Design a protein around this nucleic acid. Structure first.
Ligand SMILES: [Mg+2]
Ligand SMILES: [Mg+2]
Ligand SMILES: [Mg+2]
Ligand SMILES: [Mg+2]
Ligand SMILES: [Mg+2]
Ligand SMILES: [Mg+2]
Lengths: 348, 274, 113, 115, 104, 64
RNA sequence: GAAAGAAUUAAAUUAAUAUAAUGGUAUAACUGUGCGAUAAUUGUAACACAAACGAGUGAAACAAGUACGUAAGUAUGGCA
RNA sequence: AUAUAUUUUAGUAAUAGAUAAAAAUAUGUACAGUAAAAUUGUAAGGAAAACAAUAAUAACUUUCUC
């Protein structure tokens, strides 16, 4: 009975509600489902017949298998194999499945879904790959964010963004969404959830928001501008919400300037890229890097050259879109930017 | 429409996109048909299956031993021939047809522990030619199939226009059904145990029957269909009954292996084999 | 206005149809859904183990066949050719019947021919 | 008898704009029955499968590895650009518009909005 | 000249709402000629049935057995009356009396 | 010959109309299209009264 | 060693295309399906092809409104 | 088990699959798939009715197992 043990197993591998635990592990069909709040509906409900003893036997079978997996995990040495065996051991646990399926996975509570645990990390990876990653890749491809900015993307982390300071309402921005100048006036906050084995004590991350659509009349084309940039940021599996609480001015290589499109200048795309820095060995402590701020262009940016020079690998991305409206002038005045240009209605 | 020009734009990533997951529409079709949350859910394993258990317990080993051939090798089938490059006109010339056939034929691998023959499906064909004048006989035939087998019948509709037979096109001439697993096991068991023994003069199945790559077909008449339990129980509701063809599709690489397998399932054979 | 044959076939196709015969959709609580998921995972794993045990037994049997064939080939070619002779026309005995779920009156027959 | 002297005048099909030639928006590059030449980039295709440039540039005939057994006609935004452009390289785009330096024009455009 | 019953407007069964077909069946017991019994699924409301002629009493399926009696339906037709009508002659005397004809 | 002409008139009392052909016995035509006078999509019905063919209503709530 | 996926390769446009013949079409333009029946709408149409004229053909872009789509977008009748 | 008042069931009707080359909606959009001949068989069935079978798995995943 290893699943009943919690000496070394994290406490999150159990259903924190006594009622639901007792109902799920009940001996006779005398209790009632806590999910059904109204008694009336509880009396109406009728569970499938002959379901608790088959459940007990299936539990015993799966638990024996998990015990064997734990036995082999306690002896494996390679961290990757250790993590894989832990996942295989706890994947089939009804309590883990309950917790993940029916509790929040984005604003997770450490005592229900702990991303320090391999099984929860793996289930979260699967959930993200099911819906979130596909939508992200579709939006990037269709809006042409990949080739314009960076050659490709192999998603390995979930990136969510929000604009809490601007207005006061709470909303995670859907990728490719159109946002008002008022909405995107102040600053974005990020949430970078990692699902792979990464050394939290050594790894550092950078985040760059760029706009590859700012018009350039010298050659009658577009160019890229570095809207926002942070370097030397450390995350954790359960504490990975980047905000002005979790970084200093030394991490800021380019303070945030808002989306300020020009009239008839087209729909501009603001793309967020998250990179992880190199991970040098034989050295203690995070490997911080200094950005050449007298070389950083900030208005004629070259992201491919930047990442090549600093040996960065992208692991996540996001995107939103902006276009002119009435509040752009107010934002320009508030940020001390020159009055906006006005371009023709026809593309000739 | 400005144009009719299909063209798929290339992508810049290796992530496979399935739009059925990005569309909020059809929430209940996102579940697999095996998922208890799917309205298409139907319990599969409700009871043990005598025929399958017998085949797994006894016939697999015997068939392996019987079909063993020492140091055997794959026999490649008739494939499309290639033009020798002795003439420039052969550069982009499509390949030639197989020597004796207009269609390519499969290769035959030696029987090994992983590819022992076994039953994969059964299909029953009921084409009531007299339904050309009466469309209700098709419904009766479908009910006959449903009662005999227990699966949902599927209608058969005329496709060709033959005047001599007075067969038009687009009319319902009968019904078909495909059986797998326990249901086909039951159908074959009841056939062998009840119906075939009750035929007047039954010697078995012809040894020169079946498509040359595994699969045995044989027919039954109306009087033969009358022997099934459901029809005999309520003769009153069966003034007329229809015959049907029965096609047993197996995993056999060749026909004689399938014949041995069916003989194991107790299907007699009488004719001289090819 | 319909014929009695029409009524008979309409009844037959009523037996066909699903109208006014299916029960309500099966809606299960979250806890029972999890229970069912565990049941199915257990059964799937179990059937996979059974299948693999059978496959391993057949692998071992085939290895035995080939080892025996090699030995017999090198020991006596006559017996090896007799063994390797094909059984293309082989059929199973007609009383090697599929097991039933309750035995017959005469369990075994002690006389033949 | 019944004399056979009925025929239709030759449809003036064929390439109407040759490789290396400079083209403007809307100009017809090819007239064809069906798609013997598919459209590449910076070019569109009409009802009768007429290829026409969507941007000013230079006409190039080429073949694309992504679409074997398919000829393509497209428009390069500069002479010095090979048209089967690298896949993982940012797309070349033409802004096209011009800034309204005139105060009155800028005012009108600023105050013009949709219905 | 053909007879068909009219088609009514088919009810639309939406995508995802299409359920499977589970016809009502009974766990019926089926007795063969011998004492053996097989459980099967049947749609007829008859939980029990026995067979008089079946696999277990057919020469083709039963070659090894020496003796095998055959039988048909009872209380139907004029079967067995060709014997019930003649009681004076009864079963080996006839076999002996059928020795030869002595005709040429 | 086999096809006749019809004047569809807009529902908004603006006087706008558009003309279309139709078969001799086709069901009465009505269609939503742009009405420049009111600057929106509005309904267009027949102007005159036409001899339309009679088609049986469908057996929908089961009869007899 | 074995299952279930994802699919890849060869071949195929000979079937099918509302209708002749030709060109095109599997990446489908062919076929099935859910919404829908909407773009088989409105005011300017550059520029080309073709061209004696008169006519004909493709169509970018601006503006008004619709239907479908998660989105990208598609639709100003029908593969030509 | 009888008697009545009220109510419920029975109008008994095909697709149960995003169906896919039997017949039916010839214009829009979104999702998805691949035909045809020929060969081998199969109650009536034959040249010709309807069903079934007919190219290759090296590489990549998840699972089970030695
Ligand atoms: Mg001509
Ligand atoms: Mg057409
Ligand atoms: Mg053609
Ligand atoms: Mg000219
Ligand atoms: Mg002119
Ligand atoms: Mg079309």
């Amino acid at each position: 009975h290893i699943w009943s043990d919690f000496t070394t197993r994290p406490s999150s591998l159990s259903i924190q509600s006594s009622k639901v635990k007792n109902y799920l592990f009940q001996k006779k069909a005398s209790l009632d489902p806590p999910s059904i709040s109204r008694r009336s509906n509880r009396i109406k409900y009728s569970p499938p017949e002959h379901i608790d003893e088959i459940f007990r036997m299936s539990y015993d079978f799966l638990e024996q298998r998990s015990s064997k997996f734990y036995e082999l995990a306690n002896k494996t040495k390679n961290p990757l194999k250790k993590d894989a065996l832990l996942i295989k051991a706890e994947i089939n646990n009804p309590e883990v499945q309950y917790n993940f399926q029916f509790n929040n996975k984005l604003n997770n509570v450490k005592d229900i879904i702990d991303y320090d645990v391999p099984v929860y990390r793996h289930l979260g990876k699967q959930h993200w790959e099911s819906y979130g990653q596909m939508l992200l890749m579709q939006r990037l491809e269709t809006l042409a964010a990949i080739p314009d900015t960076l050659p490709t993307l192999v998603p390995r982390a979930e990136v969510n963004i929000k604009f809490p300071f601007s207005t006061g309402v709470n909303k995670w921005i859907e990728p490719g969404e159109f946002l008002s100048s008022n909405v995107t006036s102040m600053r974005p906050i990020f949430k970078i959830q990692e699902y792979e084995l990464v050394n939290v004590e050594k790894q550092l991350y950078t985040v760059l928001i760029v706009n590859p659509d700012v018009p350039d009349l010298s050659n009658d084309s577009f160019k890229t501008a570095l809207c926002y940039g942070l370097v030397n940021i450390n995350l954790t599996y359960n504490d990975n919400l980047i905000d002005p609480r979790k970084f200093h001015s030394s991490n800021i290589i380019a303070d945030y300037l808002p989306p300020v499109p020009e009239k008839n200048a087209g729909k501009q795309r603001f793309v967020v890229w998250v990179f992880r820095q190199p991970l040098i060995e034989d050295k203690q402590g995070p490997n911080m890097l200094e950005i050449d701020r007298k070389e950083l262009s900030r208005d004629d940016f070259d992201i491919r050259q930047f990442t090549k020079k600093y040996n960065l690998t992208a692991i996540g991305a996001h995107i939103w879109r902006s276009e002119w409206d009435a509040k752009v002038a107010a934002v320009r005045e508030k940020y001390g930017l020159p009055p906006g240009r006005v371009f023709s209605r026809v593309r000739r | 429409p400005k144009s009719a020009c299909s063209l798929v734009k290339p992508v810049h990533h290796l992530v496979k996109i399935d739009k059925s997951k990005l569309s909020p529409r059809f929430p209940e079709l996102k579940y697999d048909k095996s998922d208890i949350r799917s309205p298409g859910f139907k319990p599969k394993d409700t009871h043990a299956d005598r025929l399958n258990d017998h085949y797994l317990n006894t016939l697999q080993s015997d068939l392996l031993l019987i079909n063993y051939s020492h140091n055997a090798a794959v026999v490649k089938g008739l494939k499309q021939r290639a033009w020798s490059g002795d003439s420039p006109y052969h550069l982009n010339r499509p390949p030639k047809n197989p020597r004796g056939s207009k269609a390519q034929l499969p290769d035959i691998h030696p029987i090994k522990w992983s590819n022992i023959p076994g039953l994969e499906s059964v299909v029953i064909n009921c084409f009531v030619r007299e339904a050309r004048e009466n469309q209700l006989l098709a419904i009766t035939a479908a009910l006959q199939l449903q009662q005999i087998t227990g699966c949902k019948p599927h209608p058969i509709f005329s496709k060709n226009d033959v005047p001599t037979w007075k067969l038009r096109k687009g009319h319902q001439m009968g019904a078909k059904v495909e059986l797998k697993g326990k249901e086909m096991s039951q159908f074959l068991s009841t056939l062998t145990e009840i119906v075939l023994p009750r035929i007047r003069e039954y010697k078995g199945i012809s040894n020169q029957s079946g498509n040359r790559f595994g699969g045995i077909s044989f027919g039954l008449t109306a009087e033969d269909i009358k022997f099934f339990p459901e029809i005999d129980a309520n003769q009153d509701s069966w003034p007329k009954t229809f015959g049907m063809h029965i096609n047993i599709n197996t995993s056999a690489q060749l026909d004689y292996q399938a014949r041995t397998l069916l003989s194991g399932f107790q299907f007699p054979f009488f004719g001289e084999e090819k | 206005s319909l014929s009695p044959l029409a009524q008979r076939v309409v009844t037959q196709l009523s037996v066909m149809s699903a109208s006014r015969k299916q029960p309500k959709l099966l809606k299960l609580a979250r806890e029972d859904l999890i229970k069912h998921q565990t049941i199915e995972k257990c059964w799937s794993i179990y059937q996979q183990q059974q299948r693999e045990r059978r496959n391993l037994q057949l692998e071992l049997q085939y290895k035995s066949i080939e080892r025996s064939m090699n030995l017999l080939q090198e020991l006596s070619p006559r017996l090896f050719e007799a063994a390797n002779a094909s059984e293309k026309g082989k059929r199973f005995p007609m009383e090697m019947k599929v097991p039933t779920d309750f035995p017959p009156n005469t369990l075994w027959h002690y006389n033949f021919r | 008898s019944r004399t056979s002297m009925k025929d239709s005048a030759g449809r003036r099909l064929g390439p109407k704009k040759y490789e290396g030639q400079d083209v403007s928006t809307g100009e017809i590059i090819m007239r064809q029955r069906g798609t013997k030449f598919y459209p590449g980039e910076n070019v569109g295709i009409g009802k009768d499968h007429s290829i026409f440039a969507l941007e000013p540039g230079v006409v190039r005939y080429y073949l694309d590895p992504f679409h074997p057994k398919r000829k393509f006609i497209g428009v390069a935004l500069r002479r010095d650009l090979k048209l089967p452009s690298p896949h993982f390289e940012p797309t070349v785009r033409r802004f096209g518009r011009f800034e309204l330096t005139n105060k009155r024009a800028a005012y009108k455009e600023e105050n013009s909005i949709s219905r | 000249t053909r007879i068909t019953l009219p088609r009514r407007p088919a009810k639309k069964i939406q995508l995802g709402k299409s359920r499977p077909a589970i016809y009502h069946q009974f766990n019926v017991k089926m007795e063969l000629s011998d004492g053996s019994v097989v459980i099967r699924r049947s749609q007829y409301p008859k939980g029990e049935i026995r067979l008089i002629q079946d696999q277990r009493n057919n020469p083709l399926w039963n070659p090894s057995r020496d003796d095998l009696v055959v039988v048909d339906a009872n209380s139907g037709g004029s079967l067995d009356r060709f014997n019930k009508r003649y009681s004076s002659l009864f079963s080996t005397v006839e076999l002996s009396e059928e020795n030869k004809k002595k005709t040429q | 010959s086999k096809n006749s002409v019809i004047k569809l008139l807009s529902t908004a009392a603006s006087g706008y109309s558009r003309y279309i052909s139709i078969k001799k016995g086709a069901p009465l035509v009505t269609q939503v299209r742009y009405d420049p006078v009111v600057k929106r999509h509005v309904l267009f019905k027949e102007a005159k009264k036409r001899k339309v063919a009679e088609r049986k209503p469908l057996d929908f709530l089961r009869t007899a």
